[PDB]
């Protein structure tokens, strides 16, 4: 039951990542072969449609009615140093010999040290005001933001 | 200890001695940050009887899953509540005698899409710098024929015929 | 090291292709995860303890920084509009006030002949208007 | 035709106003803080930052398009609003 | 002649005012403390009035 739900989540999220992949590839090849006459509206439109559509769709398929993806853990069965043409046909024009390097390259959750230094700076900024001014700011922001969305939703009528 | 996923643990002198049980011996010399010192398996190794002391001494045990003879031995950590009651804690797969904790399916996608949004953010904030606007000019980046030529053209064709080109 | 003649817009392509590499990493890892061979899944119940109240404080500082950047780009564009408005169509006002003009297609033409004034001279005085503020 | 051009101007105006309103409302909605579940604070925050910046850029672009519409309307008025040509000719 | 053209000039200035009111409203929302929430409501009504009369 839940494994069918996991299979559906994996297929749907692979679909969204495939759309983002094709969008990124179309944008980069458009920048290369279409370099001339390129207005700032064209690239703003591409940036907006790419990031808006594919980030929001990935988030909404990541946060509704899904199995918890912390629960599934990725483990390999075999490591066989041979040119597997079925793997070449599976992963699309990429992924050479299934050997000791590719799985230690892919199962990598250490980020780049720049955003790690960013995270250090966020923890540094977390050492400031908390739990009274924090709760107060959260409540006031949510209140005034709901008030403004109420204003605009009223005036839209 | 802060991020157990970003650590690696090896011992090079214990690489050429690697057999099936010797994977878990390799796992239990000492001073692996992944493998616990307070595991039951240490108390198994203290006195004797490694056959049933995984089971009579209930707790966290370290169960080897899948065996490939050169490099790949999958060590899985479980908590037992009784004999034949197995509950997963964590996974640790070895590659050439190098243990890696197996990451979750969520955290890998989150880390990759984190790098995604960061890279496209840097790209977009660079691209937003170049565009310059004016209402008259528009956008930019910060980086005839007199119609008696039909007769002249027919005369050119007659010249082509009357005098051909010669390479 | 050389690329298809793109000497501006290279760093944007570096960031985008790095994104393309890690997105191909995601497609790769979920595809090899999706087949049972070469990669497998095990359901594990594990739990984490958050050492600090991360959603409140992290969402707070990140949303204030995001709103800061958004207000920056918005107000920068606003002051660009202020300096941008503070000349072509005024010259079109003066030119139409003296001359006879019209628009065909995107082109803006004008009549130079006295055919409006009564001459049957077989010659049209079509002069073009060319933005260059204005030229003919 | 003239009707077609006027319709096109109406379409552009409706689209620009709609885009400014939608982008502002969406920025305000994202500005809401919500409790996280399977979104990994850091990733959620960068995605939100990118969305806000892109929407602000879209609002600025819509303002530039409204300036373009005003310019086109000015050109149409200067070229073929018959009454003012008649008063200019008479004066 | 100056009438409709000056109307177009005013709408140019009010498009600028619409963008500046958008920016000022998110300026006030980005503040650590935003005490003048009434002024936030005034700037919001100013923004929507600008867009509507444009």
Residue A5's closest CA among A57, A66, A58, A52? A66
Tell me the C-alpha distance between C66 and D45, whole Å: 8
Decide: helix, strand or coil at residue B57.
Answer: coil
Please, how many CA atoms are within 13 Å of residue C14, restricted to the half-sphere of its CB?
Answer: 7
Cα angle for residues B115, B121, B124 (degrees, 5° grid): 140
Q: Does D56 touch chain A (CB under 8 A)?
A: no
Partner-chain contact C74 E26, CB within 8 Å:
yes
- Burial class of E40 by CB neighbour count within 10 A (0 to 12, 13 to 18, 19+): buried
Supply A85's token pair: 């043409």
Q: Which residues of C touch A18 (CB under 8 A)?
A: 27
E21 and E46 Cβ atoms separated by less than 8 Å: yes
Helix (H) or strand (E) holding B94: strand B85-95
Q: Which residues of E touch A150 (CB under 8 A)?
A: none
Edge-to-edge, what's the strand order for the sheet holding B98-101? B60-67, B73-82, B85-95, B98-101
Helix (H) or strand (E) holding D61: helix D41-80
H-assigned helices in chain A: 2-33, 40-63, 85-90, 102-106, 113-126, 133-155
Compute the nearest-CA separation of A74 from chain C (Å). Answer: 5
Cβ count within 10 A of residue C80: 18
Helix (H) or strand (E) holding E27: helix E2-30
Q: Does C33 touch chain B (CB under 8 A)?
A: yes
Residue A68 main-chain phi, psi, to 5 deg = -65, 120
Tell me the C-alpha distance between C107 and C129, whole Å: 8
Tell me the C-alpha distance between E9 and E54, whole Å: 11
Partner-chain contact B124 D47, CB within 8 Å:
no
Tell me the C-alpha distance between B48 and B58, whole Å: 16
- Residue owning tokens 């002024």: E39
Compute the nearest-CA separation of D85 from chain A (Å). Answer: 36
Partner-chain contact A79 B95, CB within 8 Å:
yes
- Residue owning tokens 């400014």: D20
Tell me the C-alpha distance between B69 and B23, whole Å: 11
Tell me the C-alpha distance between D12 and A71, whole Å: 50
Query: Which one-letter DSSP state was computed for residue A82?
Result: S
E23 and D20 Cβ atoms separated by less than 8 Å: no
H-assigned helices in C5-136: 11-34, 54-85, 88-98
Tell me the C-alpha distance between C37 and C22, whole Å: 22
**Minimum Cα–Cα distance from E16: chain D residue:** D63
């Amino acid at each position: 039951r839940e494994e069918k739900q996991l299979e559906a989540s994996l297929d749907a999220l692979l679909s969204q990542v495939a759309d983002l992949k094709n969008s990124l590839g179309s944008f980069i090849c458009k920048l290369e072969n279409e370099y001339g006459r390129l207005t700032w509206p064209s690239v703003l439109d591409s940036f907006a449609l790419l990031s808006g559509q594919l980030n929001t769709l990935n988030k909404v398929l990541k946060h509704e009615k899904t199995p918890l993806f912390r629960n599934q853990v990725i483990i390999p069965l075999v490591l066989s140093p041979d040119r597997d043409e079925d793997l070449m046909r599976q992963t699309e024009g990429r992924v050479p010999v299934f050997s000791h390097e590719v799985v230690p390259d892919h199962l990598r959750t250490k980020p780049d040290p720049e955003v790690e230094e960013q995270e250090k700076q966020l923890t540094t900024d977390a050492a400031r005001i908390g739990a009274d001014a924090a709760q107060k700011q959260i409540q006031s922001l949510n209140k005034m933001c709901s008030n403004l969305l109420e204003k605009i939703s009223k005036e839209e009528r | 200890r802060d991020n157990l996923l970003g650590i690696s643990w090896v011992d090079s002198s214990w690489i050429p001695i690697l057999n099936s049980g010797s994977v878990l011996d390799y796992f239990s010399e000492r001073s692996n940050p992944f493998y616990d010192r307070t595991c039951n398996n240490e108390v198994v190794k203290m006195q004797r009887l490694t056959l049933e002391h995984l089971n009579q001494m209930v707790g966290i045990e370290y169960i080897l899953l899948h065996a490939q003879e050169p490099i790949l031995f999958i060590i899985r950590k479980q908590q037992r509540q009784s004999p034949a009651q197995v509950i997963p804690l964590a996974d640790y797969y070895i590659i050439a005698g190098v243990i890696y904790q197996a990451p979750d399916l969520g955290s890998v996608i989150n880390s990759r899409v984190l790098t995604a949004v960061h890279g496209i953010q840097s790209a977009f904030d660079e691209a937003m710098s170049y565009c310059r606007y004016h209402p008259s000019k528009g956008y930019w980046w910060h980086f005839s024929s007199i119609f008696q030529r039909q007769r002249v053209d027919a005369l050119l064709l007659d010249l082509r015929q009357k005098f051909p080109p010669k390479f | 090291k050389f690329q298809p003649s793109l000497w501006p817009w290279d760093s944007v392509r570096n960031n985008l292709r790095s994104a393309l590499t890690e997105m191909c990493v995601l497609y790769d890892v979920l595809s090899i995860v999706r087949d049972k061979k070469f990669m497998t899944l095990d359901p594990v119940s594990q739990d984490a303890l958050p050492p600090k109240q991360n959603p409140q404080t992290l969402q707070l500082i990140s949303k204030k920084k995001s709103l800061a950047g958004a207000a920056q780009i918005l107000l920068k564009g606003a002051e660009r509009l202020t300096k941008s408005v503070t000349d072509f169509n005024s010259e079109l006002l003066r030119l139409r006030q003296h001359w006879k003009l019209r628009k065909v297609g995107d082109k803006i033409l004008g009549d130079l002949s006295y055919r409006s004034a009564g001459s049957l001279f077989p010659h049209h005085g079509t002069f073009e208007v060319i933005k260059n503020p204005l030229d003919v | 035709s003239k009707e077609t051009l006027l319709q096109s101007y109406n379409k552009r105006l409706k689209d620009d106003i709609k885009s400014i309103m939608d982008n502002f409302t969406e920025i305000i909605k994202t500005a809401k803080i919500e409790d996280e579940t399977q979104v990994s604070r850091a990733t959620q925050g960068e995605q939100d930052n990118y969305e806000m910046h892109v929407r602000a850029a879209n609002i600025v672009r819509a303002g530039e398009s409204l300036m373009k519409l005003v310019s086109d309307l000015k050109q149409f008025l200067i070229l073929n609003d018959f009454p003012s040509v008649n008063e200019a000719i008479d004066q | 002649l100056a009438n409709e053209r000056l109307r177009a000039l005013e709408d140019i200035e009010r498009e600028i005012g619409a963008i500046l009111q958008n920016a000022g409203t998110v300026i006030l929302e980005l503040s650590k403390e935003k005490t003048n929430e009434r002024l936030l409501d005034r700037q919001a009504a100013a923004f929507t009035a600008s867009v509507q009369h444009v």
